[PDB]
Structures are given as structure tokens and as C-alpha cells.
Paper text:
[name], also known as [name], is the largest ubiquitin E3 ligase in the human genome. Unusual for E3 ubiquitin ligases, [name] possesses two unrelated ligase domains, an RZ finger and a RING domain. Unique amongst E3 ligases, [name] also encodes a dynein-like arrangement of six AAA+ ATPase domains, two of which contain Walker A and B motifs and are catalytically active. Recently, the E3 ligase [name] has emerged as a restriction factor for phylogenetically diverse pathogens.
Author numbering: 378 to 387, 397 to 408, 412 to 413, 420 to 453, 463 to 466, 477 to 499, 522 to 567, 583 to 599, ...
Write the structure that this text describes.
């Protein structure tokens, strides 16, 4: 037989009766609050599964209907809830459902986890189609109260809110802090995440819908949660032309539109402060750095390479990523160089000087397993842009720095073609810059003082 556990809300004796599929109970705990929760167990045949089995309580209806659906039955027991014998009862029963379904998470293990998942799926199937802002608000209340081993509960809360379509109304902070792993080690992170992510479920989609929020609502705590998403993403390895990968893949932000948030986030100082607080994350998840490099505007990229110079010293294979990131910003760079604003051009010069610092300082430290010649090409791209947008002569330092980057990359190691392209771009820049002769008609003075 397959068993069903009916619950109900309201001396007298209650009885369970209906169709003869089983013609014509016990006290659980009298909550108080002017109500009692009365339950009952009954085991029906094993062939009556997924069949309508209307029932009754002797009940006042403002016939009930059961569906023991074979798609949600686990060990073989079903749990029917929310039976009342309205909105007030709905809220009370939501509270009790939350408490009951979380009373199984005591011994975090695959067994109790799957039991919780099965009970939740069953009851929510019964709930969403029984045949509501207040309900969502009160459920958020009880959830926050019951919850405030942190990563598992964060993922569980995320799964729940996505199942109950409970948007995080103004407090993404708390859930993103829960999903933020204080673990300073990668193995510990994977250990905390595995027992809960190994379950077949839509973790990636939930995390992506959580990350899109906190970006469309203009916040930053979600960054600390990016690592988890990455474990759920199962990203692919880099190839011979990693530069050809889109910015969303290379940055490990698939399914997220970050360019709008990147360009519309008006306070990047707090972003960098949050980052520096959670710098340990960079060690447990490699791509995180990249992701961050992708979520920062071109005006606050040097600070990101400076504050986290130590990490790059521990992880020099990230230096190259910087270049890649800058490549994915080429338009903006050009948008800045095609103009003559000294501040932004100077920021770009600073960026390139920082990249040269990284190369030289950490020239004797990069791991040959991450030093692909693709970056050479990437560098060349950069050069071309710096030589195509930089029209004035008082900005030779940027073509010079680009050529120096190419030189250091070649020294780190096709090559001839990249050198040809670099020389060609330099000659083109000199041509489009030196349009008049070097010396005056008399020859006494030069035309361009800086030639």
C-alpha cells in the first residue's frame, strides 16, 4: 500500500472518509492562537496511484480532491496539507509548512535532503493549483525568522523562493551573504557545496535569476555568491583561441547581462571595498577575478589590478586574463581615445603601464600552462586600437606602451606576423600623425617639437 498523511486546521472526534478506494484520527499539537492542527494517516492501495480520491471531514466548504501523483512520490508516502475545516489560515499553514519541511534539515545528508525536496515538491504542487502578496510577505517573514552550514541553507532558501516565486523584496543582502562562503580554501567550499548541488535540480537557473536581480536592482553583494554559481555552471576549459570566447563565457557569467550593470553602476568604490573584504574568494574560485574584471567599468580597472596585486602574485595566470578583459573593453577604450579628454586617456595610459608592471614584475612567474599565444594576438588587437584611435602626436606614449607589451609577450615566448602587424600599425600612426615635413622652410626649427 501507498500511504497518505492528511493534515487539517480548525471534545470532538474528527474522521477521514470519502470514496471507497481505501463506506461512511489523532490530536497532533494544539497550536493555540485559536486553532489546532489535526492530522491523520491512511494507507490506500498501490493501484490507486495518481487517481482522484475526493475526501471529506466529519466539512464546510466555501468536495475536496486528492492526487497522489507518481511524479512526486518518493519513498512511497504522500503528504496532503493546507486542508482547512481563509487568508489567515493560508498564512498560518504556510508558517507550519515551512517549519515542518525545515525540521528535516537537522541532519544534513542526501537522505533528509531528498526527503525535504520531495515533501516540498508534493505540497507545492498541491498548493499552486488548489482544486497573494500577503502570503509571500508572511512567508518571507517566517523564513528570515527561522533562518536568522550556511551555504547549504542559502541554496535551500534559494530553491524554495524560486519554487514559491518569492522575489527577494529589498533584502537580497541576507541571502547573498548566506551564499557567500567564508571558506578561505577551495576544497572546503566544494565540500560544503557538493552534498547539496549533487542533487538533480535547477541550481544554475535559480542562481542566475538571483544574480540578474541584485544587478537590475543595483546592488553588489551578489558578487560574493558568484563562486557558487560557477560550481553550478560547469564551465568548459579554455581553447587555443580563448580570446574568441564571448565576454559572458570567458568571465563565467553566462546567462547574465552585466554590461548594462557595469556601465550603469554609479558607485564603484563600494564595489571595490566589498571585493577587498572578500578577496579570499579569488583563491577558491579562479574565474571570479575575471568575472569581477568584467563587472568593473574602464574607469576603475587600475584599482582592481592594484588592490589585488598580491593575488596575481599568488596566481600569475590571472595576469593574462587582464589583457583579455581589456580586449573585451576595446570599444569603450576607443570611445575614450577618439575623444581628447586628458583624464580618460591618462587612465588608459595608467592601465597599460599597470599591465607592463605586471608583465615585467611577474615575467619570471607566469605558468607555461596558461601562457597561450592567443594573448599575443590579443595584445596586437590592443595595439591597433591604440594606434587607430590615438590621432594626436602628444599621445605617443600609448602606442609605445602597446608595443612594449607586445615586446614583453614575445620575450615570454605567429610571432613574426604579430610583429609585422605591430610595426605596420606604428608606421600607420606615424604617417597619419606626421603629415607635414620635419623641418621648416629654413631648416632652423623642427615642425613637430616632439618628433
Amino acid at each position: 500500500g501507498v500511504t497518505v498523511f492528511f493534515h487539517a486546521i480548525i471534545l470532538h472526534k474528527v474522521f477521514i472518509r470519502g470514496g471507497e478506494e481505501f463506506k461512511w484520527l489523532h490530536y497532533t499539537r494544539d497550536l493555540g492562537h485559536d486553532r489546532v492542527l489535526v492530522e491523520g494517516i491512511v494507507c490506500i492501495s498501490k493501484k490507486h496511484l495518481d487517481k482522484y480520491i475526493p475526501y471529506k471531514y466529519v466539512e464546510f466548504i466555501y468536495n475536496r480532491c486528492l492526487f497522489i501523483k507518481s511524479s512526486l512520490l518518493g519513498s512511497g508516502d504522500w503528504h496532503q496539507y493546507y486542508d482547512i475545516v481563509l487568508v489567515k489560515g493560508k498564512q498560518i499553514a504556510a508558517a507550519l509548512m515551512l517549519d515542518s519541511t525545515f525540521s528535516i534539515l537537522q541532519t544534513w545528508d542526501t537522505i533528509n535532503l531528498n526527503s525535504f525536496f520531495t515533501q516540498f515538491e508534493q505540497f507545492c504542487f498541491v498548493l499552486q493549483q488548489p482544486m497573494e502578496k500577503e502570503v509571500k510577505r508572511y512567508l518571507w517573514q517566517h523564513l528570515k525568522k527561522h533562518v536568522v552550514s550556511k551555504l547549504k541553507t542559502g541554496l535551500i532558501v534559494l530553491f524554495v523562493v524560486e519554487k514559491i516565486e518569492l522575489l527577494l523584496e529589498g533584502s537580497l543582502d541576507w541571502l547573498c551573504h548566506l551564499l557567500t562562503s567564508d571558506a578561505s580554501s577551495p576544497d572546503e567550499f566544494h565540500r560544503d557545496l557538493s552534498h547539496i548541488l549533487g542533487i538533480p535540480q535547477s541550481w544554475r537557473l535559480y542562481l542566475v535569476n538571483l544574480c540578474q536581480r541584485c544587478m537590475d536592482t543595483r546592488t553588489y553583494t551578489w558578487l560574493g555568491a558568484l563562486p557558487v554559481l560557477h560550481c553550478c555552471m560547469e564551465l568548459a576549459p579554455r581553447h587555443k583561441d580563448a580570446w574568441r570566447q564571448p565576454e559572458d563565457t570567458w568571465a563565467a557569467l553566462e546567462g547574465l547581462s552585466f554590461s548594462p550593470f557595469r556601465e550603469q553602476m554609479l558607485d564603484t568604490s563600494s564595489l571595490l571595498q566589498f571585493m577587498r573584504e572578500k578577496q579570499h574568494l579569488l583563491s577558491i574560485d579562479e574565474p571570479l577575478f575575471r568575472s569581477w574584471f568584467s563587472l568593473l567599468p574602464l574607469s576603475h580597472l587600475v584599482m582592481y589590478m592594484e588592490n589585488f596585486i598580491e593575488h596575481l602574485g599568488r596566481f600569475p595566470a590571472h595576469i593574462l586574463d587582464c589583457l583579455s578583459g581589456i580586449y573585451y573593453r576595446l570599444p569603450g577604450l576607443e570611445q575614450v581615445l577618439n575623444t581628447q579628454d586628458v583624464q580618460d586617456v591618462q587612465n588608459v595610459q595608467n592601465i597599460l603601464e599597470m599591465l607592463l608592471r605586471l608583465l615585467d614584475t611577474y615575467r619570471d612567474k607566469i605558468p607555461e600552462e596558461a601562457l597561450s599565444p592567443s594573448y599575443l594576438t590579443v595584445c596586437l588587437k590592443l595595439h591597433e586600437a591604440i594606434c587607430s584611435s590615438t590621432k594626436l602626436l602628444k599621445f605617443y606614449e600609448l602606442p609605445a606602451l602597446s608595443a612594449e607589451i607586445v615586446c614583453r609577450m614575445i620575450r615570454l615566448l605567429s610571432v613574426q606576423t604579430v610583429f609585422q602587424g605591430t610595426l605596420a600599425a606604428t608606421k600607420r600612426w606615424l604617417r597619419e600623425v606626421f603629415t607635414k615635413n620635419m623641418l621648416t622652410s629654413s631648416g632652423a626649427s623642427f615642425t613637430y617639437v616632439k618628433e
